[PDB]
Design a protein around this nucleic acid. Structure first.
Ligand SMILES: Nc1ncnc2c1ncn2[C@@H]1O[C@H](COP(=O)(O)OP(=O)(O)OP(O)(O)=S)[C@@H](O)[C@H]1O
Ligand SMILES: Nc1ncnc2c1ncn2[C@@H]1O[C@H](COP(=O)(O)OP(=O)(O)OP(O)(O)=S)[C@@H](O)[C@H]1O
Ligand SMILES: Nc1ncnc2c1ncn2[C@@H]1O[C@H](COP(=O)(O)OP(=O)(O)OP(O)(O)=S)[C@@H](O)[C@H]1O
Ligand SMILES: Nc1nc2c(ncn2[C@@H]2O[C@H](COP(=O)(O)OP(=O)(O)O)[C@@H](O)[C@H]2O)c(=O)[nH]1
Ligand SMILES: [Mg+2]
Ligand SMILES: [Mg+2]
Ligand SMILES: [Mg+2]
Lengths: 330, 318, 257, 235, 332, 352
DNA sequence: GGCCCCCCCGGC
DNA sequence: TTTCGGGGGGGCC
């Protein structure tokens, strides 16, 4: 790196260093801590969605086992490094079959993002894992479990990293606010958690952008409005008004309301579609075909939007689909 | 803190053929062959965590006794097994001269022989024949179809079956007795339920429990272990109403952290093998699931797409 | 400039780099007022290389403050090949440099070739793994060691070294057969350059990979003798002494099982 | 052939047959040869007497449904063999290209199972496209059009200017024809290639064969007795 | 200069020349003082000023001289396979930042990191994108990444998670009129009232298209040599907008409902070269915003128009699609 | 030399239809130093390439018409060798990357970038010897380019505009991606009217001295071309040759062979509706496709011929057009065209 | 010993 | 047949 840690992005500045700084995965953290505290470390696998703390957890565990010099006592490989059959057959085998250079102890191999590895390399890894288990332990990290071969999964003990809970996100936000000398409104925190979707990376990025947005962060307070302008996301009031107009007004009024709401702050149609879907999924529809039509048509519109197209036609299609689907309610 | 304990999967790996559970007929045949000798060329096939490598290693050890280090040549996917290797190293080993008891022969073990290329398998053909009076070959594979027909013709087929709940329970109870592990019946039932006939997974989960929480009960097992998501997908796709299917998809899969691609692939696989639904309905469901899978691959992987897939599936199943 | 170090003949640095370029990928130099000390670890984390070129090897060596330089040996060798084998070589660096300057000068003519190699942000420590008290320390001509390694590596991919009272044994056990070479200490007053010395504390028996020894023996072109220090529970040290510095290979033995 | 015969059998698609020969077995049968099963199915799905027709459905409607699914499977195949290598979709292709259409027209073969004719036709199309490209770049300087426009519009008039004269004025046409060729940097090989493109009522094979041998010999002698320009040097 | 197209000649030189992207330009300017620039992912519709914004940020961060030693720009014209990602990008990100000069440190902030700009990142394969995941995080102290794309869905989820997202809003007559008026004033283009608003409405979020249309109108006016204000009719003619007379003829033929007459009219219409996208857009505008049609008619026509637009977006024949759409509307 | 090519205009003043487009092109050429990238779209055979050449001749000198063909070599990642035939002039260059199919991308990354990133030696009309002008590159059939090939053009146009200017010509704009359309000045090229086609044909006849009983002949030929001037000229030449350079009132209109085959296929589809008929239709489709007849052309002509039948009702025509739209989309997204054509024919047979 | 080239799979 | 990427096995050197 260069200069102090204050030059780093918040996603990297607040990376957990120890195992007590990881939040939202209490069960997994406790289990791994107990395993490391008694020498009962098996071949580990961490399966989870993006931005949940798998890499942070494994690096913290390696630091706990070895110490500050963990980088000189582990073999860490990821998607940026070639991991072909030759690599598995030579480099990994040599690392697993040899003693530590610096200080005594067992050998740890961290194959981060192993789901990117080919089937041949994973197959070659089988006996490598099973033969040097006396002195070596393997850790695998994955987001998609369908890419891993059945045998490799069979040889590993699985741990699932759940989407981050609300309480853990609030505690981390409190720590970040205290360190950064920031003030966050309760509704601002609510909006941040809602838009995070269980990812701490999104929380930290949005909070950094909000801090940048404030003119005088020293005594200014971050409000839900700041989040909405920073992210460009529709306000809940805007979504509610659009849905109300679509559901109990004529086509002209609905079109005018949608256009005005979108042009007030330059909102995107995709965010509106997601918001309306979230609102409608809480509705109690009398008829199932209403929900079926809503889901099918909105999914089609979302797929069409994903490839460009005409924005006005797409908005009119959204309005018409909602109206037609709700006509079935009677 | 820097010293590792041997996992139970390796600490209690069967060392004699009598300790291998399941496939009683094949194990009895192997035991009688060891008692008499004259081991033939064989191919052991099956699924993960059943005891193929254990069976081959135990047979070779008991057959060759003290001469294991000189009469056994073991090669796996972690070793180079190209055409040159087959034509030089294996040929030299087969042509080697070694003194063994009357009815004993050198053993060439090729673990995970499925990965071997066609050229190497073809080269092995005449080598297995010219030197059959001193060397015998034992292939171990997961998919027998990957071994060429000429090689299959020369060997004895040994297709292993998945371990039943009774055998897994027996071996697990032996391990518990040896390690003096407090347990409850429901915990063992949950361990077997998650094992799905895989002894390695069963032992790994049993160690994770006890190592993690102590007394083995359903609560701790399910705290550390997750019920196989294929069953959840099957329940989701068999719901009577769209509301229930969406509720399952949200609570049990989406909020648990499972990716959309994993969910759609599992749905495809589960729909393929739903013997209680008509073939035409399954084919229509597979068409819809393929449309959704293509959409997800294009990059649009969202809860809305999976909900639309479920809605279309319920449309078809009506 | 902050650091200015002149090699009278570029062949010296080219040879020193040539001694360990086949076993490591990224090297880290750390220049001080007492010379240039460099470290390099291999991709498999099995072999470490430590070089300690002294100030007596340069025509003039000036270094104000300690300076770190992370480089890739491939690019360094590529550029060093550019310069001729009859020209003076100046290594030049500035305060917190972004590049290292290699200046080839031919006094015969007025031709000056300056090459700037961009540095890498390699942040690591040396840890000075030089375990105090070893179990055995032997010294013998590099030619004999190279011959033994080349002969035995052709039998097996692993070589075992046993140190017993007045006995050094190299054993290889391959597929076609096995090979053992036994050498005992001896001294020749007429030609001490060929003598073999052994100082023993406890018996030693350590296995090593043949590839790493084959890489290490390439340093025999720099020194006529090699010192091998062995100790259980510690990496094996292979030292080649130079005019003012030395080159050390720390090789981790294989797990016994 | 065996895969086509087994997969186009109505027994396996019945309730009892599907119970014995399952969908997984059908997908495995496809995977036995995944490069030729779709082509064989597409070739042999119109030559069977079905035994799985739904009540009120006709053979033509089932054929149309099978063709629709075959087109969808073709799209999926194009996606698989792309810049992204989406091989994970191979099982879906199995259901879209081979299994579903056969299940829709499963029955008893009404004739000999025929080998797929798409490969030879594709090779012929590639050869003719290369010939068309050669003609186009031999005449680009004098023409204002693309290869498709050259084939669809120009070539008939070139026939009227190049082949008709030989049929009317006998050997005397040679000179004129040569001139036209010289006006567009055309050679004898290009002449034959152009004559080999027309289809339908404008096939010149029989007419060309009927041309007198002496006329063709004189045309060749005249062509080889002169010096002709070159459109592209070192082709 | 006078030898360059207006679109390139009026490319924002600094971050103060970006017209309607303040919600992100504000934080980008703040980074100039905070020196903690995060990994950025710019996404939005065409011609919203993403490449210009990143280039201006580089201008204001490093300066004219230190730029080339601190920027690595790769676009779709450059090979960006998995091998390239794992070798060239990794090597550049691993290097130490170039030494600034005394002038650079005296004038420009010179943050302590370099920038890699993967423009048009939506054209990169999934494996190549995955190869960047740990490269972005490991060397964040010396390198920062800017991924610029048009379709955010084509970026894999981990990469989007690692990058702070910035959406560029569409440019319309309410937020981009000032820049177009400034360009016209500098270029001395005399236009009637509402001509610039009409240009921006026709552009539909693309300011580059609006500038090009203004340049075309200016060239036409200069060649005419009449010294008269440019009118909206000429702007519409240069933009390929169908005249309202043809549109009312089309809707009347659709109202008639005869298949043969509609087919003949479409055959005659297609010989004029009108783009099907413009026809569909104008038909949508005419129908959805007309009080003479009931709710059900609009409900059906909205879906029909959406289907036709989606089909046209896949490079399909315009004649067949237009005929099908018109027939279906006539049968509503 | 055919009359279609022997009387092609070579200057903006020689154009004889769509005078508004001619004036627009003259205005563009008045101050060509700041000319943006151009994209000419319109029906086939209208005269788009002629107008592009006339605009180039207006910008540069008459020397744009001295064209020479050369061969450029390319190497793929697999070492496969590829060849591209490039037409070049002392002032402009021409390329048709679609000729290499999916490999067209390489052109945009190798040839074009080579032209724009380096200056060119100009030893004529120059004193220093280095060109003081931008190079004009013409991409034909731009609508046939792959999406990645088009994406490779964006920064090339946006970075080297000071040296390279692109004039793309396409028949349809739907295949072109939005960024490329945004980066170009769009020029619509309307098809010539019947009166203008008749005037051109009359001029050609007078120059060639072809006897005409009445001028109405040229009218009918104009109507049979559906606005295609190239087809009109070629048809006039063919009829004149087949009628001994003398056209009478009874002279039939000659249609090309593939159109006749498609019409016979339509008649067969209408008459018979069965699976055997579908097999014979597959045979005919294979015959058509094996002779360099594009699948999209086959689909369009078949659909319109079916819709031009005096025996089908409105419902049949609606079903036919819907199926044609669906299967045109399928063809755009597929590789094996025969499958989609057979599916369309089967659906049409079912509906009828 | 190292490039360089050609050929062949890719689901479960 | 067939659009990358990975692996093997042989041919120059
Ligand atoms: N449980 C967590 N507690 C605190 N911070 C977290 C947590 N999880 C993620 N983060 C934050 O997000 C950043 C990235 O965390 P990561 O460990 O990279 O997540 P990840 O699951 O390994 O990412 P993937 O699966 O490779 S996309 C960290 O620097 C943390 O600041
Ligand atoms: N029949 C068995 N009886 C007791 N333990 C078994 C049995 N099968 C498997 N195990 C246990 O699981 C561990 C691994 O068994 P393996 O023999 O490696 O399975 P495998 O079928 O050879 O694996 P594959 O097919 O290469 S994925 C053994 O060490 C045993 O501890
Ligand atoms: N915010 C803006 N302010 C001023 N001019 C703009 C702005 N956005 C676009 N333009 C103008 O349009 C031209 C092109 O802008 P670009 O930066 O290339 O847009 P872009 O979004 O990066 O293009 P894409 O997404 O790769 S198609 C600029 O040179 C400007 O002349
Ligand atoms: N007399 C005359 N002929 C024209 C004109 N424009 C085009 N043509 C003729 O029409 C033929 C086809 O023109 P072309 O540009 O190749 O069609 P396109 O490229 O498909 O647009 C040419 O051979 C010309 O001879 C014109 O303005 N006047
Ligand atoms: Mg990670
Ligand atoms: Mg095994
Ligand atoms: Mg851009």
């Amino acid at each position: 790196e260069k200069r102090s840690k204050e030059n780093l992005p918040w996603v990297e500045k607040y990376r957990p260093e120890t195992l007590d700084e990881v939040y939202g995965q209490n069960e997994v953290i406790t289990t791994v801590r107990k395993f490391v505290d008694e020498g009962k470390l098996p071949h580990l696998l961490f399966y989870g969605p993006p931005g949940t703390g798998k890499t942070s957890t494994i690096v913290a565990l390696a630091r706990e086992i070895y110490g500050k010099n963990y980088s000189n006592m582990v073999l860490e490989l990821n998607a940026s490094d070639d991991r072909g059959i030759d690599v598995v057959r030579n480099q990994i085998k040599d690392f697993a079959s040899t003693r530590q250079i610096f200080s005594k102890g067992f050998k740890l191999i961290i194959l981060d993002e192993a789901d990117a590895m080919t089937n041949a390399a994973q197959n070659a890894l089988r006996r490598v894992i099973e033969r040097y288990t006396k002195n070596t332990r393997f850790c695998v990290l994955a987001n998609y479990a369908h890419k891993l071969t059945p045998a490799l999964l069979s040889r590993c003990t699985r741990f699932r990293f759940q989407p981050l809970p609300q309480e853990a996100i609030e505690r981390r936000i409190a720590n970040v606010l205290v360190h950064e000398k920031l003030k966050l409104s309760p509704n601002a925190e609510k909006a941040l958690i809602e838009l995070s979707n269980g990812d701490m990376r999104r929380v930290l990025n949005v909070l950094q952008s909000c801090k940048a947005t404030l003119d005088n962060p020293d005594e200014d307070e971050i409000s839900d409005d700041v989040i909405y302008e920073c992210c460009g996301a529709p306000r809940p009031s805007d979504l509610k008004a659009v849905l109300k107009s679509i559901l109990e007004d004529d086509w002209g009024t609905a079109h005018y309301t949608l256009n005005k709401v979108r042009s007030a702050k330059g909102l995107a149609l995709i965010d509106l579609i997601e918001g309306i879907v979230k609102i409608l999924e809480d509705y109690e529809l009398q008829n199932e075909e209403t929900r079926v039509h809503l889901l099918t048509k909105l999914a089609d519109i979302e797929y069409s939007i994903s490839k460009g197209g005409n924005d006005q036609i797409q908005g009119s299609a959204v309005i018409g689909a909602i109206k037609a689907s709700f006509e079935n309610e009677t | 803190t820097l010293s590792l304990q041997l996992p139970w999967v390796e600490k209690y790996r069967p060392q004699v053929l009598s300790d291998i559970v399941g496939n009683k007929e094949t194990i009895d045949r192997l035991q009688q062959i060891a008692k008499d000798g004259n081991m033939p060329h064989m191919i052991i096939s099956g699924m993960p965590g059943i005891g193929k490598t254990t069976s081959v290693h135990c047979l070779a050890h008991e057959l060759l006794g003290r001469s294991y280090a000189d009469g056994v040549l073991e090669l796996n996917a972690s070793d180079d097994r190209g055409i040159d290797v087959v034509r030089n190293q294996i040929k030299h080993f087969a042509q080697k001269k070694l003194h063994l008891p009357p009815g004993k022969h050198k053993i060439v073990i090729l673990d995970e022989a499925d990965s071997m290329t066609a050229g190497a398998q073809q080269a092995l053909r005449r080598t297995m024949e010219l030197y059959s009076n001193s060397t015998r070959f034992a292939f171990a594979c997961n998919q027998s179809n990957k071994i060429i027909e000429p090689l299959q013709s020369r060997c004895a087929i040994l297709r292993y079956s998945k371990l039943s709940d009774e055998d897994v329970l027996k071996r697990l109870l032996q391990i518990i007795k040896l390690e003096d592990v407090k347990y409850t019946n429901d915990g063992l039932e949950a361990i077997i339920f998650t094992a799905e006939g895989d002894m390695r997974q069963a032992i790994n989960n049993l160690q994770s429990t006890v190592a993690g929480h102590g007394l083995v009960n359903a609560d701790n097992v399910f705290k550390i272990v997750d019920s196989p998501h294929p069953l959840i997908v099957k329940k989701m796709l068999l719901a009577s109403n769209l509301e229930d299917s969406i509720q399952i998809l949200r609570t049990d899969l989406w909020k648990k952290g499972y990716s959309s691609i994993d969910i759609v692939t599992t749905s495809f696989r589960v729909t393929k093998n739903l013997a209680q639904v008509k073939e035409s309905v399954r084919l229509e469901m597979i068409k819809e699931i393929g449309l959704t899978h293509m959409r997800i691959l294009e990059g649009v992987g969202t809860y809305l797409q999976l909900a639309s897939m479920l809605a279309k599936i319920h449309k078809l199943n009506n | 400039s902050m650091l200015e170090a002149k090699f009278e003949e570029a062949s010296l640095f080219k040879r020193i780099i040539d001694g360990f370029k086949d076993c490591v990928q990224l090297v880290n130099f750390q220049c001080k007022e007492d010379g240039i000390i460099a470290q390099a670890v291999d991709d498999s984390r099995v072999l470490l290389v430590s070089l300690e070129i002294g100030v007596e090897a340069f025509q003039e060596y000036r270094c104000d403050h300690p300076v770190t330089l992370g480089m890739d040996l491939t690019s360094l060798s590529k550029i060093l090949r550019c310069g001729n084998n009859t020209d003076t070589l100046t290594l030049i660096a500035d305060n917190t440099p972004d590049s290292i300057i290699l200046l080839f000068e031919d006094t015969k003519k007025d031709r000056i070739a300056e090459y700037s190699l961009k540095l890498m942000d390699i942040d690591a420590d040396f840890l000075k793994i030089e375990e105090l008290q070893y179990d055995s320390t032997l010294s013998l001509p590099s030619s004999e060691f190279s011959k033994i390694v080349r002969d035995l590596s052709q039998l097996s991919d692993s070589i075992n070294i046993m140190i017993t009272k007045e006995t050094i044994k190299f054993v290889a056990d391959g597929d076609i057969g096995s090979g053992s070479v036994i050498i005992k200490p001896f001294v020749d007053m007429e030609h001490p350059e060929t003598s073999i010395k052994l100082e023993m504390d406890q018996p030693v028996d350590l296995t090593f990979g043949a590839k790493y020894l084959l890489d290490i023996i390439k340093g025999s072109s720099l020194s006529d003798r090699v010192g091998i220090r062995l100790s259980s529970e510690a990496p094996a040290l292979f030292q080649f002494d130079l005019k003012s510095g030395f080159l050390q290979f720390f090789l981790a033995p294989k797990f016994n099982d | 052939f065996d895969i086509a015969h087994k997969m186009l059998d109505g027994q396996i698609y019945s309730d009892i047959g599907s119970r014995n020969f399952t969908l997984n077995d059908k997908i495995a049968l496809y995977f036995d040869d995944f490069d030729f099963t779709p082509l064989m199915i597409q070739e042999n799905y119109l030559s069977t007497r079905p035994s799985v027709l739904k009540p009120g459905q006709s053979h033509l409607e089932a054929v149309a449904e099978a063709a629709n699914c075959i087109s969808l499977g073709d799209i999926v195949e194009k996606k698989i063999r792309s810049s992204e290598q989406l091989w994970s979709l191979l099982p879906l292709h199995a259901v879209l290209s081979s299994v579903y259409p056969a299940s829709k027209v499963a029955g008893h073969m009404a004739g000999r199972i025929n080998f797929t004719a798409w490969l030879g036709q594709n090779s012929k199309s590639a050869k003719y496209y290369r010939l068309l490209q050669e003609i186009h770049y031999h005449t680009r300087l004098g023409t204002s059009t693309d290869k498709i426009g050259l084939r669809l519009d120009y070539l008939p008039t070139f026939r009227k200017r190049l082949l008709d004269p030989f049929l009317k004025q006998g050997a005397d046409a040679i000179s004129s024809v040569i001139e036209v060729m010289d006006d567009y940097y055309l050679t004898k090989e290009d002449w034959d290639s152009i004559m080999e493109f027309f289809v339908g009522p404008d096939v010149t094979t029989a007419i060309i064969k009927k041309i007198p041998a002496t006329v063709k010999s004189g045309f060749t002698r005249k062509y080889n007795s002169m010096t002709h320009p070159v459109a592209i040097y070192r082709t | 200069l006078a030898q360059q197209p207006w679109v390139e000649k009026y490319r924002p030189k600094n971050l103060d020349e970006v017209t309607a992207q303040d919600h992100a330009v504000t934080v980008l300017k703040k980074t100039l003082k905070s020196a903690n620039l995060p990994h950025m992912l710019f996404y939005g519709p065409p011609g919203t000023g993403k490449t210009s914004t990143i280039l201006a940020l580089t201008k204001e961060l490093y300066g004219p001289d230190l730029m080339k030693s601190r920027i690595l720009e790769l676009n779709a014209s450059d090979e960006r396979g998995i091998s390239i990602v794992r070798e060239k990008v990794k090597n550049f990100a691993r290097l130490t930042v170039s030494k600034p000069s005394k002038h650079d440190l005296e004038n420009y902030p010179c943050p302590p990191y370099k920038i890699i700009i993967l423009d048009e990142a939506d054209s990169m394969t999934a494996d190549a994108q995955s190869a960047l995941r740990r490269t972005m995080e490991t060397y964040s102290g010396v390198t920062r990444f800017c991924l610029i794309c048009n379709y955010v869905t084509r970026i894999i989820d981990p990469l989007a998670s690692r990058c702070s997202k910035f959406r560029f809003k569409a440019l319309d007559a309410s937020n981009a009129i000032d820049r177009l008026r400034f360009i016209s004033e500098q270029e001395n283009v005399k236009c009637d009232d509402g001509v610039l608003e009409r240009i921006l409405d026709i552009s539909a979020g693309d300011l580059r298209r609006g500038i090009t249309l203004l340049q075309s109108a200016s060239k036409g006016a200069q060649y005419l040599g009449d010294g008269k204000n440019i009118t909206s009719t000429q702007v519409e003619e240069l933009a390929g907008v169908v005249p309202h007379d043809i549109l009312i003829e089309i809707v009347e033929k659709v109202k008639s409902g005869d298949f043969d007459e509609i087919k003949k009219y479409v055959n005659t219409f297609m010989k004029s070269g009108w783009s099907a996208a413009s026809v569909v857009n104008q038909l949508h505008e005419y129908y959805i915003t007309n009080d003479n049609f009931d709710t059900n008619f609009k409900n059906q026509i909205s879906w029909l128009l959406f289907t036709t637009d989606s089909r046209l977006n896949n490079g399909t024949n315009e004649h067949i699609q237009l005929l099908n759409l018109l027939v279906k509307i006539s049968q509503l | 030399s055919l009359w279609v090519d022997k009387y092609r205009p070579k200057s903006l003043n020689a154009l004889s239809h769509n005078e508004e487009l001619t004036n627009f092109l003259k205005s563009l050429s008045d101050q060509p130093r700041d000319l943006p990238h151009l994209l000419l779209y319109g029906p086939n055979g209208t005269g788009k390439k002629t107008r592009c050449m006339a605009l180039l001749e207006s910008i540069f000198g008459p020397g744009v018409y001295r064209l020479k063909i050369d061969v450029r070599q390319f190497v793929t990642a697999s070492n496969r060798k590829l060849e591209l035939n490039v037409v070049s002039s002392p002032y402009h260059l021409e390329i048709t990357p679609s000729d290499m199919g999916n490999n067209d991308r390489i052109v945009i990354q190798e040839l074009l970038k080579e032209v724009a990133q380096m200056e060119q030696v100009d030893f004529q009309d120059s004193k220093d010897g280095l060109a003081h002008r931008y190079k004009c590159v013409i991409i034909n059939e731009a609508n046939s380019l792959t999406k990645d090939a088009q994406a490779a053009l964006r920064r090339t146009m946006e970075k080297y505009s000071k040296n390279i200017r692109l004039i793309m010509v396409c028949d349809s704009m739907s295949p072109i991606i939005a960024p490329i359309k945004s980066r170009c000045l769009l020029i619509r090229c309307p098809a010539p009217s019947d009166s203008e086609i008749s005037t051109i044909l009359s001029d050609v006849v007078t120059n060639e001295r072809i006897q005409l009983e009445t001028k109405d002949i040229l009218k009918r030929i104009a109507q049979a071309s559906n606005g295609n001037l190239r087809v009109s000229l070629l048809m006039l030449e063919s009829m004149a040759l087949n009628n001994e350079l003398a056209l009478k009132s009874s002279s039939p209109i000659i249609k090309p062979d593939w159109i006749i085959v498609i019409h016979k296929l339509t008649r067969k589809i209408v008459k018979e509706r069965s699976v055997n008929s579908l097999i014979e239709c597959r045979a005919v489709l294979y015959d058509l496709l094996a002779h360099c007849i594009p699948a999209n052309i086959i689909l369009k002509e078949l659909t319109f011929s079916l819709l031009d039948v005096e025996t089908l009702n409105t419902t049949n025509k609606s079903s036919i057009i819907e199926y044609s739209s669906v299967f045109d989309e399928r063809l755009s997204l597929g590789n094996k065209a025969i499958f989609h054509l057979e599916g369309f024919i089967a659906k049409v047979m079912c509906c009828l």
